[PDB]
Amino acid sequence: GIREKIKLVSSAGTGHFYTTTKNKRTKPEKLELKKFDPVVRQHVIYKEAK
Amino acid sequence: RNGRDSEAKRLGVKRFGGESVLAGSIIVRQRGTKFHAGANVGCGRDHTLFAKADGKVKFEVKGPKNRKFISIEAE
Amino acid sequence: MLQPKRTKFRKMHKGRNRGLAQGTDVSFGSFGLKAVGRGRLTARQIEAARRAMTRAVKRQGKIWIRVFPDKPITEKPLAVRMGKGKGNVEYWVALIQPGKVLYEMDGVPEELAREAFKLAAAKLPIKTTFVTKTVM
Amino acid sequence: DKKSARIRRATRARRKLQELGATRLVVHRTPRHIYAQVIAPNGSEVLVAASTVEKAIAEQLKYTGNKDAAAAVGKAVAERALEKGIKDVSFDRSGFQYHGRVQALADAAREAGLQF
Amino acid sequence: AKTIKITQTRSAIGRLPKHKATLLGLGLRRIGHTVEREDTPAIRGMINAVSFMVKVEE
Amino acid sequence: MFTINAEVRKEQGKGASRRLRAANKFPAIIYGGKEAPLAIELDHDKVMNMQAKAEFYSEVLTIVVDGKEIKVKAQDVQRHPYKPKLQHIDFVRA
Amino acid sequence: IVISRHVAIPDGELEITAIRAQGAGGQHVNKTSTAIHLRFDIRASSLPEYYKERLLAASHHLISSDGVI
RNA sequence: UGCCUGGCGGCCGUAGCGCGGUGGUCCCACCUGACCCCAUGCCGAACUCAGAAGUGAAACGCCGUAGCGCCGAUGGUAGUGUGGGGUCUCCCCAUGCGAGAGUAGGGAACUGCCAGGCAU
RNA sequence: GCUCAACGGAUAAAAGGUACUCCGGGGAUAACAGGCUGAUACCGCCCAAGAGUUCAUAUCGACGGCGGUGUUUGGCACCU
RNA sequence: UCCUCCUAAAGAGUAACGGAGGAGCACGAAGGUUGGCUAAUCCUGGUCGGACAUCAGGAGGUUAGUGCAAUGGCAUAAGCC
RNA sequence: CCGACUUACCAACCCGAUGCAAACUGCGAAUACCGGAGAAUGUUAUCACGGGAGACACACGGCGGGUGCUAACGUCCGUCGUGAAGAGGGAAACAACCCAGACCGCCAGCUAAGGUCCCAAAGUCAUGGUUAAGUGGGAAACGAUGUGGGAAGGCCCAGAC
Ligand SMILES: [Mg+2]
Ligand SMILES: [Mg+2]
Ligand SMILES: [Mg+2]
Ligand SMILES: [Mg+2]
Ligand SMILES: [Mg+2]
Ligand SMILES: [Mg+2]
Ligand SMILES: [Mg+2]
Ligand SMILES: [Mg+2]
Ligand SMILES: [Mg+2]
Ligand SMILES: [Mg+2]
Ligand SMILES: [Mg+2]
Ligand SMILES: [Mg+2]
Ligand SMILES: [Mg+2]
Ligand SMILES: [Mg+2]
Ligand SMILES: [Mg+2]
Ligand SMILES: [Mg+2]
Ligand SMILES: [Mg+2]
Ligand SMILES: [Mg+2]
Ligand SMILES: [Mg+2]
Ligand SMILES: [Mg+2]
Ligand SMILES: [Mg+2]
Ligand SMILES: [Mg+2]
Ligand SMILES: [Mg+2]
Ligand SMILES: [Mg+2]
Ligand SMILES: [Mg+2]
Ligand SMILES: [Mg+2]
Ligand SMILES: [Mg+2]
Ligand SMILES: [Mg+2]
Ligand SMILES: [Mg+2]
Ligand SMILES: [Mg+2]
Ligand SMILES: [Mg+2]
Ligand SMILES: [Mg+2]
Ligand SMILES: [Mg+2]
Ligand SMILES: [Mg+2]
Ligand SMILES: [Mg+2]
Ligand SMILES: [Mg+2]
Ligand SMILES: [Mg+2]
Ligand SMILES: [Mg+2]
Ligand SMILES: [Mg+2]
Ligand SMILES: [Mg+2]
Ligand SMILES: [Mg+2]
Ligand SMILES: [Mg+2]
Ligand SMILES: [Mg+2]
Ligand SMILES: [Mg+2]
Ligand code: NA
């Protein structure tokens, strides 16, 4: 539908990322979650990307 | 117009009363909780009742609502 | 011509007609017309029999119809192949088992009731009999 | 009813503890007279108990039904439990908030030695 | 100890699979074949299952 | 004052009761009080001619079973679905 | 069979026969009686008077001189 | 040991509801006060705390009452596995299983652990 | 990154006509005729409201019911 | 193509151009947890206000709700804050 | 404004009674299925893994159904049987129905279904009854002092029909 797949990139130096979806029409603010980074093995902030 | 149906889901009781199961064995596949988890029985996200221990399947109607529970007798 | 208002579904399976009836007693009147045989009563047959009764007895007396067709019968149009979906609902039948009281009558002598029930049974596809209300 | 509201408020944790097979320290609060029991995993028989309706406890409290009385009951029940050998219990609010007298009882039980 | 003689009096051709399995469990092969079996409730239940085609003498 | 002769049923159930009603009797039961229920057979012609009176269902009846006279009352009657026949009668004692 | 709120043909006053049609169709048109020949005797009908009268007075290609539609 | 009460269970309507009566030493409940612990998308209603003067009004418990709910035979009936039969999309016979409903009736729960009070 | 939705997706990429037709087959399957059936068709009977100046049944017969035949159109696809 | 019910003969499965309906998503909260709460619909009373708004009480009992079909669930709520 | 009248009409809820349901269920079988134990029986009949297939047009009959018209030697499922791929006997003849599974031979015997007057093997068998219709040896609603049996009932040697 109108939900676009976005990429949450780790704020650590790792190129690690999760992928999710987002309704950019209703929520135009970036996702700023705190997910587990398996490269550094810590919970760091993942920020939305493309 | 008609003509559509769904693939059958193969629900229902897999292991019946008195049957010896291993831990993790699926006992009943259901939509809601027709059967409720008793002792040593877990309920999955799709409400699948599974054995959390090795033992025998046991059905009861305990409770104030007379609902049916499945437990694993650790035998 | 009796017919249900706003049923759940338009069409139903053929089903069977095994078993004995349930409403086998004269519950509302003094006399009744009970089905000895098994079959289908269409709404047209029920209405014909009711008119025969209501004319044989004059405006006097009360008449109960104990049966409702409540079952749609479909037919395919003529010159249509087999298949292409179930046919269209043409009429409604009541399923009748042996013993079903079909009509009851009250407020008339038994002789008038008998001749009215005969006039009406002549309109029905089912073998009938005359019954009276029994104490217990 | 406040009683029925509280019992349905407690039912979930009670059934969870019964499922876990835990020995439970059940508290019961009343405007006067807080109560505590330690009940076996089978839930049908009491292992230990302590309350301000007991004279040996109430004799040392100027009011039974306050935080100090609750702390006294908590210390007493945890002492009796540790003497019977019951160390690892689970707390059962019985539908009361874990805020005042109930929290005082639970804290007193913790400092006395009951692990929960 | 107590035995019972069972003869097959009818054919097994168009019989139910369970009936043919019962005749096998009794040991009956032919029509007119007579076996001698132990007189236990299980044997009696087999004889009951296929009574329409076996004859019993005790 | 209705009197009905009856024998006790030796065999009971579906096939036995059907054999009875074919042999022109019909089963009946007597119950009530502390005495156990008593299964009896009635002559269908006799009882069908008797029950045609509306007082059969109000008066206290008597049933002669094994010589014993049991005062009863017609409690329930199972009639044939469409035939003018009786299938079963319940008699409450006294 | 209905003509008006007061005029309906009893459906037995209407003779309907089956015949073979003209034109294309092959063996099926040769052998099959798909064409309908409807005959309706106006005088022998239970049609209203003045309806019988107008039908018998009309000069229509579908009404024969014997008073048959 | 008895009675009463509180808590936690078993059991899940023979156990619930209604109707009537009844209990306040203790317990319980309402209750009193609230700036505080804490609380109200407003409110000390609730939740919470500090208490206990008053009342058992309500609630709750107990005791009666069947007006209901509920339980419920026996017998019969329905259905039905197997074999057989007929007049055969419905039945019957032999045998085995045998309801549901209803009827007679039952029925105002029973019980375990702990604690407290009173009487002993 | 695929209404690859004909959704196990044959290509990245594809509509028609043939009575000018052709081949391999099929009675696996239509058109004729036969068969089974009898919805339809046609014929008969039952009930009898009524019409018939009265009068159901001289004649006709509503609302309904039960059959027969195997002329129609069909259904099926058993033969070819 | 997928989902729900029935057909489907009380395990599973089960066909038809059989009978009925939906999906091709939504949601960073509509997820997690903790704490708390319990509906529909009526009646009575009440400014505008009304069949129907909000308030109070009673009855009622989940006849509601479950982001979207249907089914099975759901009060310990899976429903509501 | 207001309002007794005309509510003799319809009529919700509720109460009492009567039914109906594939897509209703406060009930609920028989069977079937799953599991465990125990005999007896069965040439392991079971499973696994390997070599080789063929087959994936099914038919009819019974039972449970959908569809069709409670049509079809119809169609579509479930399940069993048979045919397919099974000869023999019976049903006149008649894959699929009934009985019954052909290793070969015999101018031996007993039986199954079905039969026993003649064709044509075997009862012109025995006992009791029914039917006159050649019913048996096709059919419905409905009609009828056909005839047999049964249970009552009305009126009747103060005389019934
Ligand atoms: Mg399905
Ligand atoms: Mg102790
Ligand atoms: Mg056979
Ligand atoms: Mg039987
Ligand atoms: Mg052309
Ligand atoms: Mg032709
Ligand atoms: Mg004419
Ligand atoms: Mg006081
Ligand atoms: Mg009071
Ligand atoms: Mg019984
Ligand atoms: Mg019962
Ligand atoms: Mg896509
Ligand atoms: Mg494709
Ligand atoms: Mg495909
Ligand atoms: Mg492809
Ligand atoms: Mg060619
Ligand atoms: Mg063909
Ligand atoms: Mg061929
Ligand atoms: Mg043809
Ligand atoms: Mg006239
Ligand atoms: Mg033809
Ligand atoms: Mg075919
Ligand atoms: Mg030919
Ligand atoms: Mg199933
Ligand atoms: Mg099944
Ligand atoms: Mg949610
Ligand atoms: Mg919560
Ligand atoms: Mg008002
Ligand atoms: Mg059902
Ligand atoms: Mg193929
Ligand atoms: Mg195929
Ligand atoms: Mg069938
Ligand atoms: Mg075929
Ligand atoms: Mg076929
Ligand atoms: Mg072949
Ligand atoms: Mg053969
Ligand atoms: Mg042959
Ligand atoms: Mg023949
Ligand atoms: Mg021959
Ligand atoms: Mg052989
Ligand atoms: Mg013989
Ligand atoms: Mg001879
Ligand atoms: Mg002779
Ligand atoms: Mg003849
Ligand atoms: Na009764």
PDB file of N, CA, C and O in Angstrom, chain D residues 3 20 28 34 42 51 53 74-75 110:
ATOM      1  N   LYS D   3     -14.437  -5.749  47.366  1.00  0.00           N
ATOM      2  CA  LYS D   3     -13.854  -7.071  47.554  1.00  0.00           C
ATOM      3  C   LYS D   3     -13.738  -7.819  46.234  1.00  0.00           C
ATOM      4  O   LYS D   3     -12.683  -8.379  45.920  1.00  0.00           O
ATOM      5  N   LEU D  20       3.450 -21.239  37.924  1.00  0.00           N
ATOM      6  CA  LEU D  20       4.874 -21.337  38.206  1.00  0.00           C
ATOM      7  C   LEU D  20       5.182 -22.298  39.341  1.00  0.00           C
ATOM      8  O   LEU D  20       6.345 -22.676  39.507  1.00  0.00           O
ATOM      9  N   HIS D  28      -2.791  -9.797  53.123  1.00  0.00           N
ATOM     10  CA  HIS D  28      -4.175  -9.340  53.148  1.00  0.00           C
ATOM     11  C   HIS D  28      -4.250  -8.091  54.002  1.00  0.00           C
ATOM     12  O   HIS D  28      -3.935  -8.130  55.192  1.00  0.00           O
ATOM     13  N   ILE D  34      -3.360  -5.830  59.342  1.00  0.00           N
ATOM     14  CA  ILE D  34      -2.750  -6.500  58.192  1.00  0.00           C
ATOM     15  C   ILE D  34      -2.453  -7.967  58.520  1.00  0.00           C
ATOM     16  O   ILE D  34      -2.320  -8.366  59.680  1.00  0.00           O
ATOM     17  N   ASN D  42       0.905 -25.939  46.153  1.00  0.00           N
ATOM     18  CA  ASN D  42      -0.419 -26.496  45.906  1.00  0.00           C
ATOM     19  C   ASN D  42      -1.538 -25.532  46.269  1.00  0.00           C
ATOM     20  O   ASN D  42      -2.692 -25.794  45.919  1.00  0.00           O
ATOM     21  N   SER D  51       0.100 -12.242  61.720  1.00  0.00           N
ATOM     22  CA  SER D  51      -0.871 -11.174  61.576  1.00  0.00           C
ATOM     23  C   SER D  51      -0.957 -10.389  62.870  1.00  0.00           C
ATOM     24  O   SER D  51      -0.535 -10.849  63.932  1.00  0.00           O
ATOM     25  N   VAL D  53      -3.731  -9.721  64.289  1.00  0.00           N
ATOM     26  CA  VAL D  53      -4.739 -10.299  65.173  1.00  0.00           C
ATOM     27  C   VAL D  53      -4.120 -11.279  66.149  1.00  0.00           C
ATOM     28  O   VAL D  53      -4.791 -11.708  67.094  1.00  0.00           O
ATOM     29  N   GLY D  74       5.533  -8.356  58.692  1.00  0.00           N
ATOM     30  CA  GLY D  74       6.458  -8.841  57.681  1.00  0.00           C
ATOM     31  C   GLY D  74       7.682  -9.489  58.291  1.00  0.00           C
ATOM     32  O   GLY D  74       8.081 -10.590  57.898  1.00  0.00           O
ATOM     33  N   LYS D  75       8.290  -8.819  59.273  1.00  0.00           N
ATOM     34  CA  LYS D  75       9.434  -9.406  59.959  1.00  0.00           C
ATOM     35  C   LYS D  75       9.061 -10.724  60.617  1.00  0.00           C
ATOM     36  O   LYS D  75       9.812 -11.701  60.538  1.00  0.00           O
ATOM     37  N   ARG D 110      11.797  -8.819  53.297  1.00  0.00           N
ATOM     38  CA  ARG D 110      13.066  -8.852  52.577  1.00  0.00           C
ATOM     39  C   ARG D 110      14.244  -8.666  53.525  1.00  0.00           C
ATOM     40  O   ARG D 110      15.208  -9.438  53.488  1.00  0.00           O
TER      41      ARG D 110
END
